[PDB]
Amino acid sequence: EFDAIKIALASPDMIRSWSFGEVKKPETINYRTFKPERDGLFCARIFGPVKDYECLCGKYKRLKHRGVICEKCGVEVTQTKVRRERMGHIELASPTAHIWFLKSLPSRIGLLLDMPLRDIERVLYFESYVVIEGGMTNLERQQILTEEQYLDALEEFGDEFDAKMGAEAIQALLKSMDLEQECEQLREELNETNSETKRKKLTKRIKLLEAFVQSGNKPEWMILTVLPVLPPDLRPLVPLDGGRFATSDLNDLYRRVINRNNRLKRLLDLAAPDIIVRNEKRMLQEAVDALLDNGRRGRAITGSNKRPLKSLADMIKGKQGRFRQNLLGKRVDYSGRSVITVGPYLRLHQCGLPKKMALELFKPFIYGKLELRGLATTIKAAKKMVEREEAVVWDILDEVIREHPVLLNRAPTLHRLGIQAFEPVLIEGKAIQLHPLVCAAYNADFDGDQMAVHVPLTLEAQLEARALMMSTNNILSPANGEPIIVPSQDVVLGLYYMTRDCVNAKGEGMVLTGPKEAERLYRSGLASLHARVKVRITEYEKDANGELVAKTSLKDTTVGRAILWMIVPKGLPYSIVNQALGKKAISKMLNTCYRILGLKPTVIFADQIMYTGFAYAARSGASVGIDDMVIPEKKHEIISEAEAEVAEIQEQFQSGLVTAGERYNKVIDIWAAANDRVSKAMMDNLQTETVINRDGQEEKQVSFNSIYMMADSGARGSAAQIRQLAGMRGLMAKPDGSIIETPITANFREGLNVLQYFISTHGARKGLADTALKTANSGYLTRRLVDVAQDLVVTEDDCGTHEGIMMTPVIEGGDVKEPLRDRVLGRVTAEDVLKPGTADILVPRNTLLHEQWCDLLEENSVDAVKVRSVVSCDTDFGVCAHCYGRDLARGHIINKGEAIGVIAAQSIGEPGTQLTMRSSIQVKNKGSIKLSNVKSVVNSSGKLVITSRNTELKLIDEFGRTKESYKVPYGAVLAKGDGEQVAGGETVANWDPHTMPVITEVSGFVRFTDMIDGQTITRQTDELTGLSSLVVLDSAERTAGGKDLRPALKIVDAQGNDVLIPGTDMPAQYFLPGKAIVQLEDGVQISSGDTLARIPQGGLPRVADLFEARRPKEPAILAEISGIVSFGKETKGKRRLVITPVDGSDPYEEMIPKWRQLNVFEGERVERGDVISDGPEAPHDILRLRGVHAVTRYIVNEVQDVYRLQGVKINDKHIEVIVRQMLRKATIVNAGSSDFLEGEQVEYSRVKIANRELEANGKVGATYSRDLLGITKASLATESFISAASFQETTRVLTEAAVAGKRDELRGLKENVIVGRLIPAGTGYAYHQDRMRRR
């Protein structure tokens, strides 16, 4: 029907072509009758007749002459909705410049006429004059004029002289502004200057000057001359219940503009003096500016009472504009809403739906069914039948329900599992019965929740509800590989009580010929549900190629494990039920069933799990009592020993032996120790309290205490909650953030007294305030993420590359945190992984790594896999099917089409609620040493000291994988060496961080080069020891006579000649920095490893500051080019740093703020990506210095650290694709033979297809540079202005798109959700393939 939406400026001829009549009078309506005004705002001739095909006044009351317009009516003759499309125009007496092009920041008329905003407004509000082609006088064109400047000029240049003001003058300036001429000038000005600031100031002005010439937008279209009025139907005038009309705000705005315009026409008729018509035109200017965007000028106008009234731009922008309130989200027919309840008899593809809601939602299907049978005739009869609800429409209703799915939806839908399609089962009742397992997907408890039902009307929508959105199809969460139909709380208690054991019961050690008579012995009353027993089970192992082989054997098991074996499908082994089956075990039971036997046995087995869990939890009778919370007998003596310890510490505090901070630290330490001891006392007293004999002496076992099974099963409860119900509830913290030294020694079974409950209320009010304010940032994070993603659709099958990121296991310094099988599960390898022995093709180079491949990776102990990542995908406008990976909720690769940006954005932002808002190296294991980034030297004693700061100390095992990693500073005492074998727990590293070592490479004698006591260094003989040290001063304390003196130590031989560095001809002089203290004095012979000086010195907003890419306040500074380094100017704002490369060109430098403790010396050579100071590091520096793969590893590690600290499983594909959407823009460095500009920022796919269709020719391409935009700056900088207008500020984006003449080749998800068509991702990707093919 139509391609792209084009936006441009509105010419006065274009506004007269939209229009149907000039709106003169401001008179709205008659108000005492019902008729409007002829001819006012709500006219007849200008727009249309209120009534359909009627002259409002009187003629044509049938259907013959539609169109005639008599003189007595001055009325058109069409439809009732004809006025909604027709718009009027107000002939503004005095020109008024647009507020969107005068105050957009930056203003469109501000950087175009080369005039400051302040000066532009002055003249615009009749407060300053502006010259326009004066003539032969001493005045510029842009230069303004004041009353005094004009008065004198008026008497001076009375002849050829022009100096107007207001929009009129502004219009002229714009009108008489040779665009083309300015281009060359600006272009020549940019090529004839070197000023950095000017360059950017000139490139931003020429960009908007050449863009205006590229389109059909004129400079004189900025000023509004023929103001357009919105259709009445769109500014509706309806009365509320009563006798008055509740009028809209736009009618106030238009009525004021028309009142003022009529006054201004009458004053220009009457020839009023100058100051009267200046105030009149100024009031018209402010009235127009208030109509368009109210409140952007000084304080907004108001009707009733002090609240400002809502203008047109406030009908567009904001949370309640048209995008976010009526075009992205709509209210919807065939929909319903009610309170949910359980109904556990359901199968997990069906839900209960009440009869009253079912007869209301399915009224047209029932009408169609009733008309088909022949029971009635006309439609009315059917509506009377279902209004009466006779006895025959319920069979009609059960025949329209049967195979027709519905979309259930819980009201805060965060990820895609919050809309699932069921089949209805009709309910006597008024509450939606919802299958319990599905509740863990919706985050739906049953404490008063409500859900909405939606009906797929058409046939393609019924098939999408059955084939994509059915609840049997969503059994794996799309964020990872974990099953989302995990059995939640009652059913794991029923299983944990069923499959367990006790050392004596009915039927101990009897033998049973099958699981059927195991259940028969449980039901008849001859054995117990947990009584250990040899049974004969027949497990089917499918060891052949798709053939199930029976093996039958006698397992020593219990009765309950055989009864649960009657429900397990064929292929699973018996050892999946042989254990005790908590919650992690039943989750991996369903996961192994899904990986082996597929989907249909896993659906029917999930239902049979839920049924048998509910049934035996009912048979269990697992209550909770007051006696179940067993108080430790050792608890009171532990509290008295802690009270004796705080008594000892305070008796030392009365005598002043210890400090106050050490007292507070000792009290918090002994109460933490006593808390851990009380928790261990109660945990022994709960986990093994049952001690029952069997045929003789006693024997112990794990307890059948009720609260212990609710904790050990993982149903509801943890260690901390069961700790607070029996042991002491810790040391609660006051809202100051610091802890309180007197704990809450009473649990909940004993009574809390008053003060302890008040401290508890501190600790809990902080948590409720944190959740109720955290949810806003979590939701706004999901919004920013799905609007930066929004476009990215799997659109190929292979990009045809060999690049991809290097997935290693991540190791922080403790034991190996996340194994390689969690990171390289289901992601397609980049090059073929060599087997760790020698040069073998273990896996090929384009294989998906599912579980079988990952097990053959874990057997061979594969180091790290080079795997394909989304950020390395070469596909223009989308992601190919291999560089994404596995489907994650489907076992296979991602299909051609499935929108991965939106599921990724939802999977990152959905756990936003669970996240929070507000010496030396000791080895642990026993293995082999390896060093990386190492340049070292052996000292005199033997410990290998390091001459490199950035050395990584890895502990590699005997197999080949890397198990530990650490960072060792410059100059540390390593107890070990390279390639060595150590023992578990042996200290291998040592240093002093408070004393920066200035250790050497060679030996010799020490001379004090440029070290003079009195100006350079100072004499501070030590007080308490006597062994003095010449203390080196810094460059700020010494005066300007000797500030140029750099103290240093250079090593010589026994004669005095300079001992050179081994490898060069340069001596090894070390320039001493500020605040140093000389350790080894003059004449002392040195060696390696000996110092030459003493140098003394996060949750959810972290996720936001990583995706939005803020800078930290003190970033780590780096080096943009390798080579030698040196210092510069002495403290003029900053302290300089000059880097001269060995082979490369010199002139790069950087002025470091000198408040940082540096890392580099003067004789040190640096590299790109090498640190100069320490602290956090901004991602833009990673991108422009190290590489794209470096910054994607930085973001995925720095945000999986937050998601792992709070314990959420998210696969890394989602963070890699939001990282792709961050660094999608690029900047040009060398324009080459293309049509770009020098420092123009252009999107990367554009410049790559440009120089890839030019490089296929003879011409060599253009060399770009990638840039990393934060997610809101990157979604507002898009080549599709509806995508950047449905999101944040619409004023800025619509003026930028309007003055650029931008066009929206739709080509994404939200443009097609706005404009009302098929999404180009899902089922509609075939439709968009067809439409893109047929052009």
Partner 1 sequence: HARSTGSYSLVTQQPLGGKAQFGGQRFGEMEVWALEAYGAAYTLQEMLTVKSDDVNGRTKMYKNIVDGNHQMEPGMPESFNVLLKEIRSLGINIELEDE
Residue 310's binding partner, choosing from partner 1, RNA, DNA, none, with beta-carbon cut-off 5 to 8 A by kind?
RNA
Residue 880's binding partner, choosing from Zn ion, DNA, RNA, none, with beta-carbon cut-off 5 to 8 A by kind?
Zn ion
**Residue 987 φ then ψ, to 5°:** -70, 125
Question: DSSP label at 574?
Answer: G
Judged by the rule CB under 5 A, the positions of this chain that interact with Zn ion are 55, 59, 70, 73, 799, 873, 880, 883
Cβ 357 to RNA, closest distance in Å?
Answer: 18
Q: Is 1111 one of the binding residues for DNA (CB under 7 A)?
A: yes
Q: Compute how many other C-beta atoms are within 10 angstroms of the C-beta atom of residue 201.
A: 12
Among 68, 70, 105, 1060, binds DNA (CB under 7 A): 105
Q: For residue 682, what are the CA distances in angstroms to 13, 636, 641, 686?
A: 86, 12, 17, 6
CB 1111 within 8 A of CB 1178: yes
Site for DNA in 1268-1307 (CB under 7 A): 1270, 1273, 1288-1289, 1291-1292
Nearer to DNA, 888 or 1309 (CB): 1309
Phi-psi region of 555 (alpha: psi -120 to 50; beta: other; left: phi over 0): beta
Binding mask 871-910 for partner 1 (x = CB under 8 A): --------------------------xxx--xx-xx----
Q: For residue 827, what are the CA distances in angstroms to 65, 240, 772, 809, 1172?
A: 71, 61, 38, 14, 36
Q: Is 483 one of the binding residues for partner 1 (CB under 8 A)?
A: no
Cβ 101 to DNA, closest distance in Å?
Answer: 13
Site for partner 1 in 319-338 (CB under 8 A): 322-324, 326-338
Residue 1059 CA to residue 1069 CA, distance in Å, equals 10
Residue 1234's binding partner, choosing from Zn ion, partner 1, RNA, none, with beta-carbon cut-off 5 to 8 A by kind?
none
**What would the two tokens of residue 704 be?**
């059948």
Residue 236's binding partner, choosing from DNA, RNA, Zn ion, none, with beta-carbon cut-off 5 to 8 A by kind?
RNA
Residue 248's binding partner, choosing from RNA, DNA, Zn ion, none, with beta-carbon cut-off 5 to 8 A by kind?
RNA
Q: Is 21 one of the binding residues for partner 1 (CB under 8 A)?
A: no
Cβ 822 to partner 1, closest distance in Å?
Answer: 23
Residue 305's binding partner, choosing from Zn ion, partner 1, DNA, none, with beta-carbon cut-off 5 to 8 A by kind?
DNA
What SS3 state is found at 728?
Answer: coil
Q: Is 523 one of the binding residues for partner 1 (CB under 8 A)?
A: no
Q: Is 381 one of the binding residues for partner 1 (CB under 8 A)?
A: no
**Residue 1242 φ then ψ, to 5°:** -130, 155
Which residue has the CB atom at the shortest distance from Zn ion? 55
The secondary structure of 349-379, three-state, reads CEEEEEHHHHHHHCHHHHHHHHHHHCCCCCH
> How far does CA 435 lie from the centroid of its chain?
31
The secondary structure of 1099-1137, three-state, reads CHHHHHHHHCCCCCCCCCCECCCCEEEEECCCCECEEEE
Nearer to RNA, 776 or 839 (CB): 776
Residue type, 1247: V
Residue 1124 CA to residue 1147 CA, distance in Å, equals 12
Q: Which residues contact 564 (CB under 8 A, 6 or more apart)?
A: 495, 498, 499, 577, 581, 612
Q: Look at the block and give the residue holding tokens 């004993």.
A: 750
Half-sphere exposure of 1214 (CA within 13 A, CB side): 24
Q: Is 236 one of the binding residues for DNA (CB under 7 A)?
A: no
Q: Is 5 one of the binding residues for partner 1 (CB under 8 A)?
A: yes
Residue 317's binding partner, choosing from DNA, Zn ion, RNA, none, with beta-carbon cut-off 5 to 8 A by kind?
DNA
Nearer to RNA, 241 or 859 (CB): 241
Query: Which range in 295-303, 658-666, 700-708, 957-965 contacts DNA by CB under 7 A?
Result: 295-303
Site for DNA in 327-346 (CB under 7 A): 329, 331, 337
**Residue among 592, 590, 618, 615 at smallest CA distance from 605:** 590
**What would the two tokens of residue 1139 be?**
């880097």
CB 927 within 8 A of CB 955: yes
Nearer to RNA, 32 or 244 (CB): 244
Q: For residue 644, what are the CA distances in angstroms to 124, 649, 765?
A: 81, 9, 33
Cβ 258 to DNA, closest distance in Å?
Answer: 10
Q: Is 412 one of the binding residues for DNA (CB under 7 A)?
A: yes
Residue 307's binding partner, choosing from partner 1, RNA, DNA, none, with beta-carbon cut-off 5 to 8 A by kind?
RNA
Residue type, 60: Y
Residue 1277 CA to residue 1273 CA, distance in Å, equals 6
Cβ 1215 to partner 1, closest distance in Å?
Answer: 17
Q: Is 452 one of the binding residues for partner 1 (CB under 8 A)?
A: yes
Q: Is 246 one of the binding residues for DNA (CB under 7 A)?
A: yes
Site for DNA in 13-32 (CB under 7 A): 27, 32
Nearer to DNA, 195 or 846 (CB): 195
Residue 799's binding partner, choosing from RNA, DNA, Zn ion, none, with beta-carbon cut-off 5 to 8 A by kind?
Zn ion
Among 214, 1316, 1333, 1334, binds partner 1 (CB under 8 A): 1316
Residue 60 CA to residue 77 CA, distance in Å, equals 9
Residue 240's binding partner, choosing from DNA, Zn ion, partner 1, none, with beta-carbon cut-off 5 to 8 A by kind?
DNA
Site for partner 1 in 201-260 (CB under 8 A): 221-222, 224, 228-231, 233-234, 236, 238
Residue 1203's binding partner, choosing from RNA, Zn ion, partner 1, none, with beta-carbon cut-off 5 to 8 A by kind?
none
Residue 780's binding partner, choosing from RNA, Zn ion, DNA, none, with beta-carbon cut-off 5 to 8 A by kind?
DNA
Among 83, 415, 666, 1307, binds partner 1 (CB under 8 A): 415
Nearer to RNA, 36 or 1047 (CB): 36
Q: Is 850 one of the binding residues for DNA (CB under 7 A)?
A: no
Cβ 59 to Zn ion, closest distance in Å?
Answer: 3
Residue 233 CA to residue 213 CA, distance in Å, equals 37
Site for DNA in 433-472 (CB under 7 A): none
Q: Is 1187 one of the binding residues for partner 1 (CB under 8 A)?
A: no
**Residue among 983, 1083, 1074 at smallest CA distance from 1032:** 1074
What SS3 state is found at 1231?
Answer: coil
For every residue of 770-838, DSSP letters joined together read: HHHHHHHHHHHHHHHHHHHHTT-BB--S--------EE--B--SSS--B-HHHHSSS--BSSPPEETTT
Residue 585 CA to residue 572 CA, distance in Å, equals 14
Q: Is 315 one of the binding residues for partner 1 (CB under 8 A)?
A: yes
**What would the two tokens of residue 1311 be?**
């443009």
Judged by the rule CB under 7 A, the positions of this chain that interact with RNA are 61-63, 236, 238, 240-241, 246, 248-249, 307, 310, 320, 411-412, 445, 447-450
**Residue among 1066, 1071, 1074 at smallest CA distance from 1049:** 1071
Residue 373's binding partner, choosing from Zn ion, DNA, RNA, none, with beta-carbon cut-off 5 to 8 A by kind?
none
Site for partner 1 in 284-313 (CB under 8 A): 292, 312-313
Cβ 4 to partner 1, closest distance in Å?
Answer: 5
CB-based burial, 971-985: b 16+ in 10 Å, e otherwise: bbbbbbeeeeebeee
Nearer to RNA, 337 or 1252 (CB): 337
Q: Which chain residues interact with DNA by CB under 7 A? A: 27, 32, 105-106, 116-118, 195-198, 240, 244, 246, 252, 256, 259-260, 263, 283, 296, 301-306, 317, 319, 329, 331, 337, 411-412, 772, 775-776, 778-780, 783, 1101, 1104-1105, 1108, 1110-1111, 1132-1134, 1151, 1153, 1270, 1273, 1288-1289, 1291-1292
